[PDB]
Scaffold this active site. Structure first.
Site, PDB file in Angstrom:
ATOM      1  N   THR H  31       9.197  40.672  65.890  1.00 36.74           N
ATOM      2  CA  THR H  31       8.486  40.799  67.153  1.00 36.74           C
ATOM      3  C   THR H  31       8.946  42.054  67.895  1.00 36.74           C
ATOM      4  OG1 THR H  31      10.013  39.600  68.594  1.00 36.74           O
ATOM      5  CG2 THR H  31       8.585  38.301  67.166  1.00 36.74           C
ATOM      6  N   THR H  32       8.306  42.321  69.030  1.00 39.64           N
ATOM      7  CA  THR H  32       8.567  43.531  69.798  1.00 39.64           C
ATOM      8  C   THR H  32       9.593  43.253  70.890  1.00 39.64           C
ATOM      9  OG1 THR H  32       6.294  44.255  69.392  1.00 39.64           O
ATOM     10  CG2 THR H  32       7.534  45.397  71.115  1.00 39.64           C
TER      11      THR H  32
END
Ligand SMILES: [Mg+2]
Ligand SMILES: [Mg+2]
Ligand SMILES: [Mg+2]
Lengths: 196, 222, 196, 249, 242, 243, 204, 244, 231
Positions: H31-32
């Protein structure tokens, strides 16, 4: 302490060991064999601290028997004496040392000669015609020094040891309840049926 | 034992007696107490003589290895640091008390090391049993900007004081001078004021005086 | 041994004597009891010379590594290093150490660590054998934010009285002044502070 | 951690030990170094080929001192030679001097370094040393000696030999030129001639290293006063001495 | 073939992982030069901050090992910082145990011995970094000593490392061929910094701004990395040639 | 991880053989030939130096015959360094036995110790075996003179006359042809020299390519390592060479 | 109870003109009780001689250890160990157990085979080397031996005179000690001839 | 040859460690996460994909606290990130114990970097599978660092890693260009919420939850604290306005 | 392919394969569902027998009077992890007189598994866990995967055909989250959830196991006739 005597005659080695084991004010047993047959032609008598004596003697016995089985050969008495002396010398500087004094009597079949070794709990080995551990020597030596001859027969040595035992039974503050006597010669190790 | 170290204008000198004693008995009447940590780094020892010899040889070996590794001349601060750290590791149980002098690329150095691992710096130092007499002589005759001969004389006089007025020291005087520009000069028996007087009679026995029971040749060959 | 450290407005000053005695014999009368663990972090040592020297060397090593890795250490950091080394080895150490430092953020700081490894930050700290003789005087003559001259005079008078009364102290009064201007080493000989 | 407990040098079906032969090959591809034993000393020599002309060749010594009377030269991988010389300098003290108070004999120091290299060829997780050493020493009882140590851990005593690139040709020249009645200067001259044969670039006292295990030099002892302690026998020749003996030729 | 994976000899007697570490050393695409003055030693490295989200003050390949030893690393920053920490610890321990500051050549030899250990033992790989230590040793003077992933180390009058290193090296060689000396005959370290920057501009053929260079100067008893403004002052002094 | 690089030295082949043991035996096959012959009044060891050069200092060279004890010596075939490691261990074990029992070590005990070390290297550890074959020549008061042989497999055997190294088959055949139970030590010397000269891949048998040893006999044995001049003398005497 | 004074015994070495001498008593006993009159304390390795005084078990263990080490040394160096090398070995071996010492007092004597220089030296229980050129003494009668030697010795004595001197010193020192005696042996060591003589003394 | 990508710490003929690059790919699959350095501290933000509505919202925290002033958020293999955070907490505890003073941000960064570089040094250990953006406020002010699986770590004005790392880096470059004076703590929080919301569009298949923390000398007195409640909802609304 | 031999080897796509093989081992295990309201937490598990003469392998383990777990996959690894969790709860209760938080238990399990998913010679665990607990925060349900990923949920399910139970819980979330103070209703909801994952099988007293924890309700297991009222 316990009485440990040994004499080396022309063709034999005689060992005498107290029959008495006393813990406290009570003699627990009056028929104690303070010897261990290390090899068919080598016996070892022992005395000292309770427990350590039998433990060290049986340990030495097991090691000598293992060597005799491995090499199919009986070590000379000198080799056994050197081995036990090395064991005791390693013990003295251990955490809990062995407090055992031993007399080794053997018949070197390769030399066909009787040999008697005296070793203390410190690893002090000496080859002597007659030897004793404890206070016993303090008497016995005085007799032996006069009455020991190199050409003595086994019966003469037995009579000399009987004289030593008589002097001990006279001038000792302890009743060691007799001695078990064993003879080591070319034919092995045998036990005198009766010594008193 | 009486050991001293004195700094002179171009280096440092150490001096000691030659009397090793087993209690009240003189064991060695000519025991050199000046040891060599490095070709130009020396030290005088006191206390447990075995400990002094052993620690000096060990630190000298380590110093030789360090010099062969760093390709540099050994330094007195290195021997000092290793000696003090080793002594502190084994506490006072290593009974060595050293006066370590030397000349290295950094200059002249004179230090003292105690058995527990402490170190002191000074221009004149004394250790051992007779250290008090020697120190009294030093405090009486030491000055700043000493010459080579002046420092040699002062150290020799301190050792002589320790020899005469202390029962723990005696015999002869060993000296080692270490100048910055030259090699170390090791004067063995620089002063010998305790030569034994000739005995009044010779005790060479007439041959056959001793009773011999048996003689036997001993085979050293194989 | 008589040692102290005083914080004034410009920084800190450490002061000590030069008498190290093995019993009643003055082993070294020119002892430098002021030891550098960092450029502007110094320590006054009392007690076992071997113990104090080893502690100071190890602290100097740790502070050099701290400088190499994370930059200049705070005075509190050297204090904490001394505290760890003394406290964790309390059963084998006999050392009392005063640590004085100067950093532009907190000006000058003094942390005394007696036996046991406890660390106490104080404006002025006294320690050593002679300290007991100057506990009163200092408390009656110490002020905060003094000048350099007044701090030198305070330390000189305190150490002079301590040297006069305590035989374990003596020699020359050595001072190290740590300020923004840097490090200054001052020496005062007996013929000066005895007449005070 | 070091999970490489198994040996990295094993026997091939041909009977050859792979890594040993590969290290010997790497040695053959190294700069030539030779040794010549005479009647009053031994000489070892090698070419100082540098990586860059900016580099100072004096800071990198191919001829190192093991003990005051024992030195060594190499042919192969420089770093292996450095670690081996450090190990040998330390083993000289730990396994002799600190026990007998004297510097080890040449044979025993050679045997110790050979044991190190054999363990390198047999232990787990390690490759053999990619060097061959020529060790020249002197002890009181065995006199002067010159030994060769190979990566396999084997060592041989030589009257004269060489290793490296021009090893075969150098050995042939030594076989043709050597005799059992040679002085130290004669051996130095023969070594210089062999090196000139084995070098293509410049040949002066600044591009060749040469040391001698000869007489005792008390001027290099560093202290005077102990008559029993004499100077060290190992001496590395200065650039000036090499250039003088080259202009003589 | 596994002679290319662990530090074992190839049939040719070659260690291929060592060569591959050498290859990795140039991954940073940065060049460094070191030169000796009369009483100083200067290192210059290219300072390349591509990403604008980077703090340019955290981009450094020159490390202050001790107060005397500085080390410029050509290679990835992980192995660079590993070698930096190890060298700092070794120098500190040396000072503690032997009482004097660890010399430049001594630290170089120690790191080179560790690198050799990496080439011989299999469980550890070599570090893909080339370490140039510089100092002013009290016994040897201005000292530049370089070590590589192969365990080799040696001293230089001047040296260069990186992708275009050869170019730089040649330039330096020429200067010495002209100067007949082994150092830069300048008393001030500012002039030696200017010399180094000038010769790097000549070799690489590029103009450097104050944010394109890292300068580390070692003088007797100190090693310090210059700020952008001191570098700018040196660049201005260089530009004001006529 | 490292599993990819393990040679697994201590594993059986599908046929029930130790790979590294066979490969070490093959390695030793290329080594020099060493021959031991035990006569009624002595033992003789004769080995051929594989390493030969005109500049090889043979006076101080000992690459084939080593003294384990004043009563025991060994002829080596194979890697000299592994052999020297095992020889150091054997000397230490012999001196330990001497210190323990105050009697010189019997030959078979030392031989079995070395063989068990070799065997342990062929069953555990993942390490390569020692590429060395030993011919032990010893004397003790139990079995008199004794000749033993041990290989990297950890197996040891006893022989009247034995050969290890190169061309062991032809050497053993020649020995079986010419050996006699009643022969004396000089006859054993001659037989060993002739077997070496007839099984050498070299042109001729010379002193530079030979190491010689005799354990002879008072109540004392003499272990004599022949010097190069003595080797040339015995060669020209036995008729192998001309002088 | 003193570990060095349980068994008793004395050893003394002296030097002369191209000769050395080393002598010892033959007594071994458990304090008051004398046990053995055949306990010799001078062992020989090659041409070097070592006399050990003190706790008997430590004497025997050290003899075995030094025989071990000298045998390995001879097999490694291919030469017989010299007296100086053996002295250094004894010192290092003793200090190896600095905190668990051998309660002994070793004394080394010999003549350097290559140089012919007579060499004698002594040690303490932790290996402090005492390298005296005149004489070395050790054992329970160390003071009596010291007195006898400092009185009788004169340098450069021929072997026939050095024997008489060392024998008289040993006898008159042992007769003043209760824990030494019961016989004595004297070795006269020359470069190529070593003679062993048993002495006749009082057996009390 | 071939096979250089099967063992860790093995240098390819190029000079690369392929296992490290594969770990970087594993990070890129994550994920970011972003970090933004402001004028008096740092702000960390992360996207938590709501795989199912069965997930308890606001729980399953992804940002981990180290000491009392350091914040860390990792993109990639979350368990490896927890291992690294635990190691960093041990390092910080050791540092505070020995030197009393809390561990500086650069010291902590170098500790984590040396740990990861050691994990890229042996074939018996796998490289880390998390890129970690961390930092906080020390006596020298604010610091924001990012550490890659290769052991390489740098100080950043703004950092971002994960699937939506490129859009986040572009928005951070815009923020750095438009604010040379520096952002404020709450402005940094709003911008982090905005950038997280903008980078979610790359994987708009499933809904996401925003998680923000900050360490500010003025807003949190130098302590790492999770942005929750009114400020979090305000940042969420700001982002929702910024998208359209 | 060539990257599935160890857990120390990374695939070119950044995937650890052995971990996926362990997850597949879980998928082929039995089905166990967990669901919790604000007051209770229920684990419903379907035990599987080798044949009709064998017993049904236990799938629910009690860790402490306030926390338990259900297993899916390798029972030995499940026992190892449950024993570690028991040890952690015991340490908390003895050294701090404090009930171990469920979230901290999940963190500890995650780190414990990661220890195995990064070192040579060690295999990752081969079991998925569903941990129910009631700490000072209330009722908690966690799903633990041997990848080291632990996630707190209102409800979930693992094993064979688990997607049906998961979708049922997604649909019935707003319904069961409000079943507070009524144990039997949550038990029936869990039974329906696990029934949503049955194919050619029917729930019997012998194959069904239930576990309940919550406020004033210690972690209790129901087997045999005790589940007859929920079938
Ligand atoms: Mg006097
Ligand atoms: Mg008497
Ligand atoms: Mg009497």
């Amino acid at each position: 302490m316990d009485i440990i005597l040994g004499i080396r005659v022309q063709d034999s080695v005689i060992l005498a060991s107290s029959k008495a084991v006393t813990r406290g004010i009570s003699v627990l047993k009056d028929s104690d064999d303070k010897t261990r047959q290390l090899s068919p032609h080598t016996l070892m008598s022992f005395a000292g601290e309770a427990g350590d004596t039998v433990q060290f003697a049986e340990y030495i016995q097991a090691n000598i028997q293992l060597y005799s089985i491995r090499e199919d050969y009986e070590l000379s008495p000198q080799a056994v004496s050197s081995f036990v002396r090395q064991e005791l010398a390693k013990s003295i500087r251990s955490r809990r040392p062995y407090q055992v004094n031993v007399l080794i009597g053997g018949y070197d079949k390769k030399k066909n000669k009787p040999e008697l070794y005296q070793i203390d709990y410190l690893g002090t080995k000496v080859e002597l015609p007659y030897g004793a551990h404890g206070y016993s020597g303090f008497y016995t030596f005085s007799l032996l020094d006069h009455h020991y001859r190199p050409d003595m027969t086994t019966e003469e040595g037995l009579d000399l040891l009987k004289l030593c035992v008589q002097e001990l039974e006279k001038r000792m503050p302890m009743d060691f309840k007799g001695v078990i006597v064993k003879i080591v010669d070319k034919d092995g190790i045998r036990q005198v049926d009766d010594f008193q | 034992t009486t050991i001293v170290g004195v700094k002179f204008n171009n280096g440092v000198v150490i001096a000691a007696d030659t009397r090793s004693t087993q209690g009240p008995i003189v064991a060695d009447k000519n025991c050199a107490k000046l040891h060599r940590i490095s070709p130009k780094i020396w030290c005088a020892g006191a206390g447990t003589a075995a400990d002094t010899e052993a620690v000096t040889q060990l630190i000298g070996s380590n110093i030789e290895l360090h010099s062969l590794y760093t390709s540099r001349e050994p330094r007195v601060v290195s021997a000092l640091q290793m000696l003090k750290q080793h002594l502190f590791k084994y506490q006072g149980h290593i009974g060595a008390y050293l006066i370590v002098a030397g000349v290295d690329p950094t200059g002249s150095h004179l230090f003292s090391i105690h058995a527990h691992g402490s170190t002191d710096v000074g221009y004149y130092l004394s250790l051992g049993s007779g250290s008090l007499a020697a120190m009294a002589v030093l405090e009486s005759h030491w000055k700043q900007d000493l010459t080579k001969e002046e420092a040699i004389k002062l150290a020799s006089d301190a050792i002589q004081a320790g020899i005469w007025n202390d029962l723990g020291s005696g015999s002869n005087v060993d000296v080692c001078v270490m100048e910055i520009g030259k090699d170390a000069e090791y004067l063995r028996n620089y002063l010998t004021p305790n030569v034994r007087e000739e005995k009044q009679k010779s005790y060479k026995f007439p041959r056959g005086t001793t009773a011999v029971l048996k003689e036997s040749i001993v085979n050293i060959c194989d | 041994t008589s040692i102290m450290a005083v914080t004034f407005k410009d920084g800190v000053i450490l002061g000590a004597d030069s008498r190290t005695t093995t019993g009643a014999y003055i082993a070294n009368r020119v002892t430098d009891k002021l030891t550098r663990v960092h450029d502007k972090i110094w320590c006054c040592r009392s007690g076992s010379a071997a113990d104090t020297q080893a502690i100071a060397d190890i602290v100097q090593y740790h502070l050099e590594l701290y400088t190499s890795q994370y930059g200049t250490p705070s005075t509190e950091t050297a204090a904490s290093v001394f505290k760890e080394l003394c406290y964790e080895n309390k059963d084998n150490l006999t050392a009392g150490i005063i640590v004085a430092g100067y950093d532009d953020k907190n000006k000058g700081e003094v942390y005394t660590i007696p036996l046991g490894g406890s660390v106490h930050k104080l404006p002025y700290a006294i320690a050593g054998s002679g300290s007991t003789f100057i506990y009163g005087y200092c408390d009656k003559n110490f002020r905060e934010n003094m000048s350099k001259e007044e701090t030198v005079d305070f330390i000189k008078h305190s150490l002079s009285q301590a040297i006069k009364w305590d035989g374990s102290s003596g020699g020359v009064i050595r001072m190290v002044v740590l300020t923004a201007a840097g490090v200054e080493r001052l020496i005062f000989y007996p013929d000066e502070y005895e007449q005070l | 951690t070091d999970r490489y407990s198994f040996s990295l040098t094993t026997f091939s079906p041909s009977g050859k030990l792979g890594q040993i032969d590969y290290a010997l090959t790497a040695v053959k591809q190294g700069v030539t170094s030779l040794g010549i034993k005479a009647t009053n000393g031994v000489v070892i020599a090698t070419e100082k080929k540098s990586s860059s002309p900016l580099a100072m060749s004096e800071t990198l010594s191919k001829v190192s001192l093991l003990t005051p009377d024992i030195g060594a030269v190499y042919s192969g991988m420089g770093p292996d030679y450095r670690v081996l010389v450090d190990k040998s300098r330390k083993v000289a003290h730990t396994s002799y001097k600190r026990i007998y108070g004297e510097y080890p004999p040449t044979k025993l120091l050679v045997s110790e370094v050979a044991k190190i290299m054999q363990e390198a060829t047999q232990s787990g997780g390690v490759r053999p040393f990619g060097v061959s050493l020529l060790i020249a020493g002197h002890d009181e009882f065995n006199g002067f000696s010159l030994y060769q140590v190979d990566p396999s851990g084997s060592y041989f005593p030589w009257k004269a030999t060489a290793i490296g690139k021009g090893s075969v040709a150098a050995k042939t020249f030594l076989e043709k030129r050597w005799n059992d009645e040679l002085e130290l200067e004669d051996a130095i001259h023969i070594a210089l001639l062999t090196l000139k044969e084995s070098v293509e670039g410049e040949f002066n006292g600044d591009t060749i290293e040469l040391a001698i295990i000869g007489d005792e030099n008390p001027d290099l002892l560093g202290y005077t006063g102990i008559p029993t302690d004499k100077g060290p026998r190992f001496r590395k020749l200065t650039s000036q001495e090499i250039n003088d003996r080259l202009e003589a030729l | 073939g596994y002679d290319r994976h662990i530090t074992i000899f190839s049939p040719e007697g070659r260690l291929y992982q060592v060569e591959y570490a050498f290859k990795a050393t140039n991954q940073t695409n940065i060049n460094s030069l070191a030169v000796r003055g009369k009483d100083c030693t200067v290192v210059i490295s290219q300072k390349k901050v591509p990403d604008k989200l980077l703090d340019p003050t955290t981009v450094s390949y020159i490390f202050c090992i001790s107060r005397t030893i500085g080390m410029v690393v050509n290679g990835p920053i992980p192995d660079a910082r590993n070698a930096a920490l190890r060298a700092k610890a070794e120098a500190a321990e040396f000072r503690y145990k032997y009482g004097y500051d660890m010399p430049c050549d001594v630290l170089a030899k120690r790191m080179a011995n560790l690198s050799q250990i990496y080439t011989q033992r299999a469980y550890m790989r070599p570090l893909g970094v080339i370490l140039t230590f510089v100092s002013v040793d009290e016994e040897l003077g201005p000292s530049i000593y370089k070590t590589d992933p192969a365990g080799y180390y040696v001293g230089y009058k001047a040296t260069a490392t990186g992708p275009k290193q050869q170019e730089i090296t040649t330039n330096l060689e020429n200067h010495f061929k002209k100067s007949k000396i082994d150092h830069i005959n300048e008393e001030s370290w500012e002039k030696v910094v200017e010399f180094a920057i000038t010769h790097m501009i000549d070799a690489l053929g590029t103009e450097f701004s104050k944010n394109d260079l890292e300068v580390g100067v070692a003088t007797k008893d100190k090693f310090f990395t210059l700020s952008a403004e001191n570098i700018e002052e040196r660049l201005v002094a260089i530009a004001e040639q006529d | 991880g490292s599993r990819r690089y393990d040679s697994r030295t201590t594993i059986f082949s599908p046929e029930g053989r130790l790979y590294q043991v066979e490969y070490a035996l093959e390695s030793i096959s290329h080594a020099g030939t060493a021959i031991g012959i035990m006569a009624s009044d002595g033992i003789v060891l004769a080995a051929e130096r594989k390493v030969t050069s005109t500049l090889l200092e043979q006076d101080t060279s000992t690459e084939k015959l080593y003294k384990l004890n004043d009563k025991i010596a060994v002829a080596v075939a194979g890697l000299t360094a592994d052999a020297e490691i095992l020889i150091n261990t054997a000397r230490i074990h012999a001196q330990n036995y001497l210190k323990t029992y105050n009697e010189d070590i019997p030959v078979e005990i030392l031989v079995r110790r070395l063989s068990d070390i070799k065997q342990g290297y062929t069953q555990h550890g993942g390490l390569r075996p020692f590429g060395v074959s030993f011919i032990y020549a010893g004397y003790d008061d139990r079995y008199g003179y004794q000749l033993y042989t041990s290989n990297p497999s950890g197996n040891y055997t006893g022989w009247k006359a034995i050969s290890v190294g190169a061309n062991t088959s032809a050497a053993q055949t020649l020995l079986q042809m010419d050996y006699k139970d009643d022969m004396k030590v000089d006859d054993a010397i001659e037989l060993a020299l002739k077997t070496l000269s007839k099984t050498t891949d070299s042109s001729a048998l010379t002193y530079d390519r030979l190491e010689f040893a005799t354990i002879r006999k008072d109540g004392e044995v003499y272990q004599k390592i022949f010097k190069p001049q003595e080797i040339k003398d015995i060669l020209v005497k036995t008729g192998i060479t001309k002088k | 109870s003193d570990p060095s004074s349980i068994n008793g015994g004395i050893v003394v070495a002296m030097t002369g003109k191209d000769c050395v001498a080393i002598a010892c008593d033959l007594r071994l006993g458990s304090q008051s009780l004398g046990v053995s009159n055949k306990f010799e304390k001078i062992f020989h390795y090659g041409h070097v001689f070592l006399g050990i005084t003190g706790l008997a078990t430590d004497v025997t263990t050290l003899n075995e250890m030094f025989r071990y080490k000298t045998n390995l040394y001879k097999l490694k160096e291919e030469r017989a160990i010299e007296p100086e090398t053996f002295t250094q070995l004894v010192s290092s071996s003793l200090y190896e157990r600095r905190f668990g010492p051998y309660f002994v007092g070793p004394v080394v004597a010999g003549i350097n085979s290559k140089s012919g220089k007579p060499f004698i030296a002594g040690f303490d229980l932790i290996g402090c080397i005492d390298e005296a050129k005149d004489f070395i003494v050790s054992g329970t009668a160390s003071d009596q031996l010291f007195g006898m030697c400092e009185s009788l010795y004169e340098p450069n004595l021929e072997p026939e005179d050095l024997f008489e001197t060392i024998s008289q010193a040993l006898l008159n020192a042992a007769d003043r000690d209760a824990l030494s005696g019961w016989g004595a042996v004297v070795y006269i060591i020359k470069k190529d001839e070593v003679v062993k003589r048993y002495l006749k003394m009082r057996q009390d | 040859g071939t096979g250089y990508d099967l063992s860790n710490s093995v240098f390819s003929p190029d000079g690369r460690n392929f296992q490290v690059e594969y770990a970087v790919k594993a990070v890129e699959n994550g994920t970011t996460s972003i970090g933004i350095k402001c004028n008096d501290g740092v702000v960390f933000a992360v996207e938590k994909l709501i795989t199912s509505k069965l997930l308890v919202p606001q729980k399953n925290v992804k940002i981990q606290v180290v000491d009392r002033h350091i914040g860390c958020v990792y993109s990639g293999l979350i368990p490896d990130g927890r291992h690294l955070v635990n190691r960093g907490r041990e390092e910080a505890a050791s540092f505070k114990k020995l030197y009393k003073t809390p561990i500086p941000i650069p010291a902590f960064a170098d500790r984590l970097g040396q740990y990861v570089q050691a994990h890229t040094l042996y074939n018996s250990v796998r490289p880390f599978g998390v890129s970690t953006i961390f930092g906080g406020v020390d006596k020298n002010g604010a610091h924001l660092y990012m550490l890659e699986p290769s052991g390489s770590y740098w100080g950043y004005k703004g950092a971002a890693t994960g699937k939506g790392r490129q859009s986040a880096k572009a928005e951070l470059e815009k923020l750095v260009d438009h604010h040379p004076e520096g952002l404020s703590a709450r402005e940094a929080v709003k911008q982090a919420a905005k950038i997280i919301y903008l980078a979610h569009e790359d994987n708009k298949e499933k809904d996401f939850e925003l998680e923000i923390s900050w360490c500010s000398l003025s807003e949190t007195n130098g302590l790492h604290k999770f942005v929750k409640g009114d400020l979090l909802q305000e940042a969420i609304d700001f982002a929702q306005k910024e998208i359209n | 392919n060539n990257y599935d031999g160890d857990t120390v080897t990374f695939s070119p796509t950044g995937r650890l394969f052995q971990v996926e093989y362990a997850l597949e081992a879980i998928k082929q295990g039995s089905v166990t569902v967990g669901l919790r309201s604000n007051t209770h937490a229920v684990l419903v598990a379907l035990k599987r027998n080798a044949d009709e003469l064998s017993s049904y392998q236990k799938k629910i383990i009690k860790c402490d009077e306030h926390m338990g777990l259900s297993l899916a996959g390798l029972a030995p690894d499940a026992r190892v992890l449950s024993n570690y969790l028991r040890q952690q709860c015991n340490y908390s209760s003895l050294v701090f007189n404090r009930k171990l938080a469920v979230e901290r238990a999940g963190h500890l399990l995650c780190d414990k598994a990661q220890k195995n998913t990064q070192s040579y010679g060690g295999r990752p665990y081969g079991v998925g866990l569903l941990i129910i607990g009631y700490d000072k925060s209330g009722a908690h349900l966690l799903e633990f995967q041997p990848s080291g990923n632990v996630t707190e949920l209102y409800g979930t399910a693992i094993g064979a055909r688990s997607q049906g139970a998961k979708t049922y819980l997604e649909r019935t979330l707003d319904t069961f989250i409000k079943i507070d103070g009524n144990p039997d209703e949550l038990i029936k909801a869990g039974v329906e959830a696990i029934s949503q994952s049955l194919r050619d099988e029917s729930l019997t007293v012998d194959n069904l196991s239930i576990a309940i924890v919550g406020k004033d309700t210690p972690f209790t297991i129901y087997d045999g006739e005790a589940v007859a009222k929920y079938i």
